[PDB]
Structures are given as C-alpha cells and as structure tokens.
C-alpha cells in the first residue's frame, strides 16, 4: 500500500520568508517594549524595495528603518552582486492604527481573560507518530536541507551560495491502520541562489555530499532516488530581485507541508489576538498532546471563532483511525484539559514573548524551543 | 458519528481578494493582446493605495491605471464614505521583466508542449459526492453568502450594504465508509460593512430573511442553528481602510474551504506556466472525474514538479477508503487518461482564455462555467 508524498521547504532568503521574517521582526520589536501591542503588519519586497503595511496600535517606539535593515543584514543581503543590499534597499512604512470598528468589539474594555477573538476563521493542528517531533518526515527534511545551507553559507565553507533557496521531498510511506511509516526517499529538488564563480558540476555535488548526505538518515537513501540538483542550470538573479515577495504567502511551508489541514490564515505580523495565528498555535499544541498521551497515532484538530467572541464556534477532532477512543470521548478529553479561549491561550503558551521572529523561518511547528511544542500531560 | 466542518468566504470588497481580482484582471488584460504573456502580479492594497508588483514579460500594451481603477469600481468602492474610491486612490506600479535566469531554464526555445513547470512545487485536487457540483457543502454556502449579498447591494435592494464582507459555515456531517453526508447546519456567521444610517437589528433581521433564507436550503437550517449576524456590532470602517490586502492570502477560500489539502501556491495574478495555478487546476479536473466516473465518492490527487521539468515528479491518489479499486488502479486510471505537462493542460483546459477575473471571487472550483469543472469521461 506504498505511496508518494511530497513538501516542500524555502530558506530565508526567499522573498516570501523575507517578508514573514520582517514582519515578525516589526512585531518582536513592539512586544519588547510594548506586550499588549496590536499588530498586523504586511509586508512586501521586490527589487531594492521593503513596503510595510498594515495596522499597529501600540506604545512602543520602534525604528522601523533599523529593525527591516537588521534584518535583510543577518539574512545575508549585503551587496547589490547579490541583487539586494540592506545598505541602499528602500524602505516604505504605511502603518496606521488598529481600526476602532474592530478594537471596540475585540478587547476595549475587557479584561485579558475574556478577549474576544480578533477574527472569526478556523485553524487546523496535526500531529504524526512517524518522527519524534511529531511531524511529517517531508517538511523536517525539507527545512533540514535549507538549515544546512544556511550554515554552510554563514560558516564561509560554501562562499558561492547565496540566501534565496528552496527544496523538495518526495518520500514513500506505507500506512499501518491509518498510521503513516516513512520508508524512502524517493526524490529530493533543491535549488539555491549562487555567484558566477562556481560551476555547475561542483554546485551539484555539493549539494549531494555536503547537504544532502549531512542531513537525511543514509537508511532513506537508495540507488534508486532521483536528484533534482540546481534543475535550472543557473540561479544568479535570486531574492526580491527575482520573484515578489509578501507576508503570508508560505503558509504550508510553515505549517505541516501539505499534510493535516490548514484554515488559511498566515500567521507572521500578528499578535497573540489573532487566532490565525493563536488559536493554530494551541491547536497544534493539543493535537502533539493527544498523540504523546497514546491516545492515537495521528490527529487533526479543528476550531473556529468569530469576531468579538472569546469561546470557539466548534471544535472537531479526526485521528484517521489511530485511536482506540472514539472522537466524541477524545473531544471530552479536550475539554476537560484545555481552555482555547485566546486570552487563556497567550496566558498558556506565553504568547507576548518577542520570540517571533525564530518562527519566521524552517517552520513553525517540530521545533521544540517553542511552548506549543512542549506536550500538556493530559487527565483522563 | 457525526462531527462540525466549518469553511469561511469572503466578498469582493474584501481587501484580500480586492488584489486577487486587480491581479487576475491584469493577467486577463494581457491575454486579451498576447496570449503568451508571462505574468507573476502581486497587487497590495491598503487605505488609499494599489500596489502592482511583480514580473511580466509580454507583448501587450496594457494602461494599468484604467485596469485597476475599473476593477475597484465594479467591485463598488466609488466614495470616500466608503473607505476607499476607484477616482482618488493612489495607483502604483512596480513591474519588471521575467528574471532571464528564469526564462531560459522553463520556456526559451521550446515548443509549447515542452514548456516546463515554471517553478516547483506540490499542488492538490479534491472532489466529493456530496453536493452536484462535487464539492463540500460547507465552503460552497459560504460563498453563495456573500454573493447573494453582493446581488442585493448591487440591485439596491439593501442599500446600507458594503462591498466588504466575510460569511463562515458550520456544517454537522456523518461519515458514510469514507464519505461525508451532510445534516444540518450548526452555525453561520456573517459580517459585512455597512452604512452609518441602518440599525444594528435592522441588519441582522435582513441577513437571516433575506440572504440565508434565501441561499441556505431550508432542509438544513433547525430552530438551535447558531446565528453570529453583525457579530461586532459596528463594521463602518471596512475595505482597504481597515484591513491592508495582499494577493494570495486567501487561498483556502479559493479552493476547498479546509477540505481536501492545498500545496501552498497561490492562484491569482499568474499565467499557465506557473504551476501552482494550471496544475491545481488540472488536479480539481483529475479528481472531480474520478468521482464523476463512480470510481470514489471522494478523491484527494498530489502532483509536483521540478522547475523546467516538464512531467510531474509524483502522482498521489487517496480515496479515503470510498473506492473498489485500489489507489495503484486509480493511477494507472490517471496516466491513461489525462497528460499533466503544463503545455498539454494549457490546451485540454483552453489556459490562455482571459477569464481569470471571474475565478478571482467566490471560489475556483464548483462554477461549471470553468474547462476544469467539466469533468472527462474516462477510459477503464
Ligand atoms: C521561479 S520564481 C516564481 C516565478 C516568477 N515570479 C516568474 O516571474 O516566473 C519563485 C522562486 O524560485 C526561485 N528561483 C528564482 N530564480 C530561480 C532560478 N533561476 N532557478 C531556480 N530557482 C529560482 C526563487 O526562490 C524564487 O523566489
Ligand atoms: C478583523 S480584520 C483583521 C485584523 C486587522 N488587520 C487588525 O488590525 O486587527 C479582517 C477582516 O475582517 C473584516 N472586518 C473589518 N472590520 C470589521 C468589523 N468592524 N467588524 C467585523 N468585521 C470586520 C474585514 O473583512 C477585514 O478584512
Ligand atoms: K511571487
Ligand atoms: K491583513
Ligand atoms: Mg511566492
Ligand atoms: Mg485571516
Ligand atoms: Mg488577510
Ligand atoms: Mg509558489
């Protein structure tokens, strides 16, 4: 019953991340100064330009020059031959406040506890058995691969790549009563931004012996994967220079690679309020409890909200047959153990931190640094 | 074992899909003069301005102030009661050529049927037997929500109504051996922006009467259905006034409404070439003839590629356990009937038609309007 699955990952200097990693980089930097700060900043790069926009309300002082030049630095955009310099680059700020139509209904008045939630939606939470960050092996090898060039980069031992990259797995999995197991690595892809020095032959072959082979378990390679390696044959012009970027546009990238679900809200730029972001967050968080707890193998969880009202609209489990418990009784165990109002949520998962910005890249979910990634013991 | 799925949708002066219906309308308005325009158009929006961004490569002498501003003039937004007008907006544009590194690898030289995929990536389709058009219930009500409000506005039959607006649906289902029949609806919530003369009761009283009860099938509406209508109380403030908008920020939306699985991409603002568009596209068709054919009740299809690879370097098929055949016979199915190069699919499903602007609201699949909602008749 074998079959194939793929995802796919992007490195920090591709133009989407730039922007996700800006955004949350604007947010960390209110929160430090100002923790109840409202935050929903876009933003948008493309050729020698970073545009913010969106709707801040908050006490913080924040130069915002300095914070998108920091930045664009530490991701390694530093000179026009690399088609983008924080140094010269163009930065446009259009940020007005939180509209009070919204700020009225969300939490003007209202104590934490009760906030209501800043939107309505709906937000999905996945967890997996195959790995033991409870994630699908696709994505974890996906980010892996652009980590690993990363390091390569800033350590000086590859001086030819450049930030802009992206990869793709395709893995083999048998399934086992609704379980997955990965078995192979059937094809990877990767490409990645590089200067004019270097050929092609040698790219590739580092690519296989100093990346590939440094980050994969050797057990899921055979003779038989197939590698996609630089498959344009030249990638000079990379970053905003090649291809627009904008916040929110990586939004399986930086969830669970196309497996579980996703509701469709991007989560860099936005506090704790919104429950796009929270509210999957803590989803995420119960589905890696019930699974560490025994209680299946695999899980999806979804919840639902509307503007203004702190309580969700509906909460639905779905273990693909991984659970001796029917969803009805994982559902009560749900109940029983968490409270997804979002002013209890930032409470729980210590949502005002400026930590944000280490999300903004390599995924938001398997890294257990973060406190929805460390598991609730559940009672039941 | 019935279970809550809830989907969201949102209306045209939704500042999101302003940009996905001003990006589209630029695709279209290229297409119309060369058919083989290459177009990545990124469109932002926010109080008072439109940002074009991105790259294309064509032929075509398009006036992008007359595009953009006869856009936002359909959709509404005439009047700066209204937060936003089409006459005194700021108009922006930031486009460039195709990146050369590019061009080279995917389309220079090649005949159209050799064209390779214009980036990689993974893409989904989906399809389920439980409504005609072989989609979920819950999404295709959300958006006849907002579209039934969009006809009453534009009618004037309701004349405090907005452009801005967003509906979300909580369908109750039981499962059937892997497919889902829906029961009843649990809860729907409405918002949309309004006028400064209408009361609050007055609105709500007209979205029950007079937009749910006449798009919701009474069958499915019980006296403890939920009803979330105006939940804010006050939506004066709205469209790019209130909330910034982004091209592809509301790709769920666009598809299946949390059903199924999405790869990421976003639809609007691109041509064929970018697969992220053309082989969802393609996937959806795959997967609703499938259903069509009585091989499942419900399909999940995977593809991906490899930038400048032509053929697809996986093919996925899930049936969630509603067909006879095994999900290796469904594939051979899939390669005997249908060729998943993109420069075959631009021609099965007539790719270089200007119509892109009419999938850029109310979703892209479900509307028998579109060549891949007409589903093939497969060979067996
Ligand atoms: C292929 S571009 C998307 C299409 C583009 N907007 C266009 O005009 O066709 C998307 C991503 O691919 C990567 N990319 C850019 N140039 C590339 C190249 N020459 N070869 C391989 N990948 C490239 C970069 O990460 C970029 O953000
Ligand atoms: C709630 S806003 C998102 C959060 C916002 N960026 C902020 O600063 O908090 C998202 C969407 O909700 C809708 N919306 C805006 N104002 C609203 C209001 N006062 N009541 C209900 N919905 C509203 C609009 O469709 C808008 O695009
Ligand atoms: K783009
Ligand atoms: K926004
Ligand atoms: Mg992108
Ligand atoms: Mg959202
Ligand atoms: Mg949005
Ligand atoms: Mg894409």
Chains 1, 2 share one sequence.
Not at 121 to 132: I, N, P, Q, S, V
Not at 141 to 158: I, P, Q
Not at 339 to 361: E, F, M, N, S
């Amino acid at each position: 019953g074998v079959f194939m699955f793929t995802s796919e990952s992007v490195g920090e200097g591709h133009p989407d991340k730039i922007c996700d990693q800006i955004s949350d980089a604007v947010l960390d930097a209110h929160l430090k100064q100002d923790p109840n700060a409202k935050v929903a900043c876009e933003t948008v790069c493309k050729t020698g330009m970073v545009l913010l926009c969106g709707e801040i309300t908050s006490m913080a002082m924040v130069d915002y020059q300095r914070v998108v030049r920091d930045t664009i630095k530490h991701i390694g955009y530093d000179d026009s031959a690399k088609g983008f310099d924080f140094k010269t680059c163009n930065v446009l700020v259009a940020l007005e406040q939180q509209s009070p139509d919204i700020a009225q209904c969300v939490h003007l008045d209202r104590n934490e506890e009760d906030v209501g939630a800043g939107d309505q939606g709906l937000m999905f939470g996945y967890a997996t058995d195959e790995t033991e960050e409870c994630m699908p092996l696709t994505i974890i090898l996906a980010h892996k691969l652009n980590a690993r060039m990363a390091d390569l980069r800033r350590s000086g031992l590859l001086p030819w790549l450049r930030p802009d990259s992206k990869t793709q797995v395709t893995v083999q999995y048998m399934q086992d009563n609704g379980a997955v197991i990965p078995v192979r690595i059937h094809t990877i892809v990767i490409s990645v931004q590089h200067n004019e020095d270097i050929t092609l032959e040698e790219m590739r072959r580092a690519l296989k012996e100093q990346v590939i082979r440094a980050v994969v378990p050797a057990k899921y390679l055979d003779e038989d994967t197939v590698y996609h390696l630089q498959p344009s044959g030249r990638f000079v012009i990379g970053g905003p220079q090649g291809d627009a970027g904008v916040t929110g546009r990586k939004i399986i990238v930086d969830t669970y690679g196309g497996w579980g679900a996703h509701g469709g809200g991007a989560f860099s730029g936005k506090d704790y309020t919104k429950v796009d972001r929270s509210a999957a967050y803590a989803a995420r968080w119960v589905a890696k409890s019930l699974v560490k707890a025994g209680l299946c193998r695999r899980v999806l969880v979804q919840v639902s909200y509307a503007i203004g009202v702190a309580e969700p609209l509906s909460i639905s489990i779905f273990t693909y047959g991984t659970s001796q418990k029917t969803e009805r009784e994982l559902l009560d165990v749900v109940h029983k153990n968490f409270d997804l109002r979002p002013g209890v949520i930032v409470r729980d998962l210590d949502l005002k931190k400026p930590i944000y910005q280490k999300t903004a890249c390599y995924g938001h979910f398997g890294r257990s640094e973060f406190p929805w990634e460390v598991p609730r013991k559940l009672v039941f």
